[PDB]
A paper describes a structure:
Carrageenans are high molecular weight polymers having a linear backbone of repeating D-galactopyranose units (G) linked together by alternating α-1,3 and β-1,4 linkages. Furthermore, transcriptomics revealed upregulation of the CarPUL during growth on ι-carrageenan, while biochemical analysis of eight CarPUL-encoded enzymes revealed carrageenan-specific activity, thus associating the CarPUL with the ability of these pseudoalteromonads to liberate energy from carrageenan. Detailed analysis of the enzyme activities encoded by the CarPUL, combined with interpretation of growth phenotypes, have allowed us to propose a refined and detailed model of κ- and ι-carrageenan processing by some Pseudoalteromonas species.
Though we were unable to produce active recombinant S1_NC, given this knowledge of its probable substrate, we tested PS47 cell extracts for carrageenan sulfatase activity. We observed conversion of ι-NC2 to a product having a TLC mobility consistent with β-neocarrabiose (β-NC2), most likely indicating desulfation of both monosaccharide residues by the sequential activities of S1_NC and S1_19B. Taken together, these results support assignment of S1_NC as an exo-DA2S carrageenan sulfatase that would likely have activity on any form of carrageenan having a non-reducing end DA2S residue (e.g., ι- or α-carrageenan).
Numbering used by the authors:
A (entry chain A): 36 to 506
B (entry chain B): 35 to 507
Amino acid sequence: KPNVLILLFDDMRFDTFSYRNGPVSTPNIDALANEGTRFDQAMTSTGLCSPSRAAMFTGRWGHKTGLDDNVGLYHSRLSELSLSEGSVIKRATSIGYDVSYVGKWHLGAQGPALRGANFMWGHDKDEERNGRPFTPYQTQKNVARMNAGERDKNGEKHDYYKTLPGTYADTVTAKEVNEGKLMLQNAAKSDKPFFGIVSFEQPHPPYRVPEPYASMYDYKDIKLPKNFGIKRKHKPMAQDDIWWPWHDVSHMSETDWRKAHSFYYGAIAMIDHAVGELINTAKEEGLYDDLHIILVGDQGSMLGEHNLYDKGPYAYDELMRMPLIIRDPSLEPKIINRQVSMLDIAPTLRQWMTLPLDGDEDGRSLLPLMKQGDSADAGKDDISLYAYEWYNGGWFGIRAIRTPEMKFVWNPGDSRDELYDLKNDPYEITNQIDNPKYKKQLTDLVHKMAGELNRIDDPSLTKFNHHMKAF
Amino acid sequence: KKPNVLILLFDDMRFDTFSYRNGPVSTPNIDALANEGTRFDQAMTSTGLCSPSRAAMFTGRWGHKTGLDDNVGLYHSRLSELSLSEGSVIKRATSIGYDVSYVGKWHLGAQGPALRGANFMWGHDKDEERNGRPFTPYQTQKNVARMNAGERDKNGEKHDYYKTLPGTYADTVTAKEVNEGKLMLQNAAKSDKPFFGIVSFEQPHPPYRVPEPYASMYDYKDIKLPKNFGIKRKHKPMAQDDIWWPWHDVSHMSETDWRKAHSFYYGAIAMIDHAVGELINTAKEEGLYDDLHIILVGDQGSMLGEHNLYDKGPYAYDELMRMPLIIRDPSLEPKIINRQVSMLDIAPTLRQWMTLPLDGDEDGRSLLPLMKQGDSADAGKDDISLYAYEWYNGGWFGIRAIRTPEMKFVWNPGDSRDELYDLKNDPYEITNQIDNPKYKKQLTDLVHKMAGELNRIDDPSLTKFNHHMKAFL
Ligand SMILES: [Ca+2]
Ligand SMILES: [Ca+2]
Ligand SMILES: [Cl-]
Ligand SMILES: [Cl-]
Ligand SMILES: [Cl-]
Ligand SMILES: [Cl-]
Ligand SMILES: [Cl-]
Ligand SMILES: [Cl-]
């Protein structure tokens, strides 16, 4: 049974890395990408922390697991993923894997340990369950100070970007690396197969890095994209509301937005260092050659595209797209340009590890694509499905279907749907939902979405068929 | 022999405005009904939101049982209609031979009264298709952006808050609803079947829109603002700060704007007092009044700047939670009831009057014993009311409140901050005492009372409550 290592990162965009022709030199990630299978059109399930992680680790959509919002935050109803959901963690433990977990969990206090893992170190490790939702009174005060024209140390805005004191060695990231090194050292001492997860809070906003990462990218040299610095025209109302207090970006200057990029880029450089330290330890311990590796970001993050920061209830590519590398040491490297989903991770682990089934797989194993390339799916529709059921206690019910040339977003809590022509408008600036020139494409996408909601037994199909009755 | 029933239902009508409650508006027709009937002077709504309160009124069950726990048809609620599995008192009355008629605001799903057997004579929902998209307030958003830039609408008004309508009373939706109600009463007098009429007015809801003379009847310059007007909210839950509906941004409101919101609302109350008189005079002219069993109720109150809030939202303040309620049984002597009653008590009261068949649980109680005996019917019983605020237009909050005459405890499970108000010493609910160790005995009492109530109604939030309140259980 093969050794598996997952390197999971929070709110890491698909596009930043040098292997994607992005602005940050990421030699260690690029080397893993070129040794493994690049999923260059990977899509998350939801641009939100807990839902994306539950889908990743269970292999089922939120309507089946119940984990359809963030946990532990104003004003979500949810505290934890049900312990009835053992996830790949309990399934691997059941067949004799030593499972270990380091870092960000965000699926309920103690959750990895309750499912049989060694939860070595992380925020959720010694927390009591059923805590009250964290309510951002301080961030509300801070953003009011920003709107009043105040700034933090050195003119920074610490709800967006911050220079941390000290060095890399003092960071949470370095501690997560060091716990991952200990995990690898301990695994090399056992004959038992191991399944390790190292889950980093970096590079999530607010973008907080020590020197030299804080200053390595000059804000003045940042290239800003075509959808930066735009007013949202004819977009759904949920994109305008201040769900979390830092979504008020009315105080942000162009310099503030540029520093949000430059500090994020420093965080990506720091993550590449962290990946190299773990890969070099895996090599030194003699585990690397047979190590089956997943590197993934749970979703992306908005850096001022459509005038949005962080995440919220919407489907733009900067949030919906995720970086994904799956390295199987038995296979030659390939680049997969067909779309894949976060729902495909658990079936891939299940095939690698011969995990027992614990119910439905709403995705598919990526091994055929890893072995054969895009030709594995020749003749099949190239779609992805995205949901945004909730944002921190706000219900939206959002569903998107994305093809290589178009995206349709159903907003059942609104009157306004979205239709983007990704071939002619890849920056998703122009909502074409009301344009009669796109009636054929809209009709196709509505039918594709109905098929997908039926496939996954989404109970919102009934409302979909009412809203879409003109098709 | 089955009694004729008339319900006069008003949207967002506060408990306190009427002259019979020593309020600032002369309301002689409502006062006369209060003086002839049973005054429920401490009536409480179930939820300060339109569709949940109306579903609880017409079904007699809480929203976790009926499913109707949010507004329907509004950004960004998941709901479109009260399930047709819920016949309500409308289908139950039709099934025993009442001719049921409905006029005006429904807000429980397109065609709903008609689908349940009523003559839906006239109203917004009568000819609407079902399963419509949620109304999303793009224009209100644009309007409030202009207000925040310092703009005003015509004649200095702010039409998301108050507006002088063109024309006369006779041109209004209210007058049309009265004319349909008069036709309903005229037709009822020609039938040998008992009748059940509901006339449900959008007035006096905000934005406060009235024609002359009601628009200028009450001088804004004379308005008395209360002690909790315009204050900075100290140590209150975060949901009271967020701009759920676009007009909740009141940062642009001057004191004069708030006084005009009051004076226009007072005009709307005067206008509905006229409407009530017109319908009561028609019932008298048609020979129906002497035996007519009448309920006058507001679905909830409305905020006029108390705690710096406008309209409604996810919170439990008395100006929203309290509702006006008069129940006139012509066989009984008039009394004033000072013990708390609930919107959940309306359906059981109708059930006793009308001998309605059981269609499931009654989460409230019939008010006939109080109507007959006065407050002493319940001597020895805890005087409590239970309030819920599960959702506000697609925002989940799970709020529960328990109110006694002297205290209120509010559980906000989507927050870390609960509320505790000493209504005896702080009736304006300015000071949140949740963290004050001097109120530990009262907090413990109210947490126990809430635990009893959630258990009684089989609320599935008891699992979470038991965790949040574990220090008290
Ligand atoms: Ca995330
Ligand atoms: Ca109402
Ligand atoms: Cl860090
Ligand atoms: Cl845009
Ligand atoms: Cl295969
Ligand atoms: Cl009117
Ligand atoms: Cl206050
Ligand atoms: Cl009785």
